[PDB]
Design a protein around this ligand. Structure first.
Ligand SMILES: O=C(O)c1cc2ccc3ccccc3c2s1
Ligand SMILES: [Cl-]
Ligand SMILES: [Mn+2]
Ligand SMILES: [Zn+2]
Ligand SMILES: [Zn+2]
Length: 453
């Protein structure tokens, strides 16, 4: 009547043999899990990474959160772990007039959706979210301090979320252009009702979340194929979230009842993630949720070979929306081509196919701007420019393969889709700036082909 819980998402329990290689495992479950957007992974019973920390020496600055459905929040923006924990336990204890382990999960869920929909309730909560640093580090073992033999067992686990971004079957690895918010783990300190709004990952990447300890985290997920249905439902009910934003640090997001989505025929799934379990989200899969109580989680983005074509589609979609990029997809592709001899052979093969499309599109774009009367040209090392100095004036895309400039407007650039948007001068005053000639590009793709055999 009031809240009807969505159906449960898939839960996998891999054997030690299946578990050994995360990328092989993720590829295996993909046909099931991409139908639901999120899934849960329970490691083998004896896989237990040790967790240890001083609750008095870890400090962090908390964010404050109002809990109202459809109200705008911004995506990104002092306690010790002990003092936060004391605040969190007392809050839950007093809210329900109960001891915390006796508060049923079904009840916290029901109550969460009651309180966010009710205008006359003004519940505020706090939480932590930050990338690993010296003041607050990874929950997984890392190399530095002498480690116990148990900790060194987990140092090079593929499921140690520090290693995940730099494994061989991973794609975001050899990226030199720093993208700190996308290759490093984030740490999250939760309390009862603190929540994460509906969103998808930057560049439509995968994400993987590990709950180290504490009370469960409740998740809702939507499969990738339904991303645009969800957005249309959201646009109708809260248009303010969809106005154009001046940068990446101004993304607007919101809390919204999954029953609202289910009423509009958007498929939604749920899960309670407990301590010691993994949740994985797939490309373009919308997700949100809330914490049941005091807890500690760690998460990281990643990109497999399966993702490469979607990554190209994502940047195209960013262009239509005038959304800023975190990195240049074409720059990453060419960086990998330049390292073709050390690439894994399946990677080399998949990169080669994306490069072939890149080259065909670039050929056609250069033919088009030549016919507009752009004649002069000069080579340019785009990867050396800071990102804010190579975004298209019109669509904000990060340039790499090519761009148009004019001496009339020093420093400004447009991508080749927006030649008409640079300035009022005739096109013979423009220059085509390019990273590679077509003749440079075909040998790069050939090296990939040889490596792939
Ligand atoms: O091809 C198959 O055998 C399966 C398809 C689905 C679809 C949604 C699902 C949602 C929750 C749990 C399992 C599924 C499965 S299993
Ligand atoms: Cl409220
Ligand atoms: Mn996420
Ligand atoms: Zn553009
Ligand atoms: Zn001009």
């Amino acid at each position: 009547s009031m809240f009807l819980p969505p159906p449960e998402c898939p839960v996998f329990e891999p054997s030690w043999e299946e578990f050994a290689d995360p990328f092989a495992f993720i590829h295996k479950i993909r046909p099931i899990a991409e139908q639901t957007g999120i899934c849960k992974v329970r490691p083998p019973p004896d896989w237990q990474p040790p967790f240890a920390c001083d609750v008095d020496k870890l400090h962090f600055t908390p964010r404050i959160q109002r809990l109202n459905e459809l109200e705008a929040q911004t995506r990104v923006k002092d306690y010790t772990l002990r003092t936060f924990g004391e605040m969190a336990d007392a809050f839950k204890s007093d809210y329900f007039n109960m001891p915390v382990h006796m508060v049923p999960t079904e009840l916290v869920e029901k109550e969460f959706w009651r309180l966010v929909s009710t205008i006359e309730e003004d519940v505020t909560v706090e939480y932590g979210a930050d990338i690993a640093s010296k003041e607050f580090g990874s929950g997984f073992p890392v190399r530095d301090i002498k480690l116990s033999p148990e900790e060194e067992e987990y140092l090079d686990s593929g499921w140690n979320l520090n290693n995940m971004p730099v494994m061989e079957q991973s794609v975001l690895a050899h990226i030199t252009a720093d993208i700190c918010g996308m290759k490093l783990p984030w740490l999250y300190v939760g309390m009862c009702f603190s929540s994460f709004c509906w969103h998808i990952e930057d560049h439509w990447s995968y994400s993987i979340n590990y709950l180290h300890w504490g009370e469960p985290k409740t998740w809702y997920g939507v499969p990738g194929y339904a991303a645009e249905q969800l957005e249309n439902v959201m646009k109708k009910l809260a248009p303010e979230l969809f106005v154009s934003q001046p940068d990446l640090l101004h993304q607007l997001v919101t809390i919204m009842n999954p029953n609202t989505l289910m009423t509009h025929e958007v498929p939604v799934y749920r899960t309670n993630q407990c301590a010691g379990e993994f949740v994985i989200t797939f490309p373009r899969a919308y997700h949100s949720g809330f914490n049941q109580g005091f807890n500690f989680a760690e998460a990281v983005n990643f990109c497999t070979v399966d993702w490469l074509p979607l990554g190209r589609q994502c940047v195209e979609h960013y262009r239509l929306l005038h959304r800023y990029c975190v990195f240049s997809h074409d720059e990453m592709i060419c960086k990998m081509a330049s390292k073709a001899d050390v690439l894994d052979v399946v990677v080399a093969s998949t990169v080669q196919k994306d490069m072939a499309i890149m080259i065909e599109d670039e050929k056609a774009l250069r033919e088009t701007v030549r016919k507009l009367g752009v004649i002069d040209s000069e080579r340019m090392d785009f990867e050396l420019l800071p990102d804010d100095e190579r975004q298209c004036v019109k669509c904000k895309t990060t340039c790499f393969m090519s761009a148009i400039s004019c001496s009339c407007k020093p420093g400004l650039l447009v991508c080749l889709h927006h030649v008409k948007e640079l300035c009022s001068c005739p096109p013979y005053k423009y220059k085509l700036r390019y990273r590679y000639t077509l003749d440079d590009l075909y040998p790069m793709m050939n090296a990939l082909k040889l490596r792939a055999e």
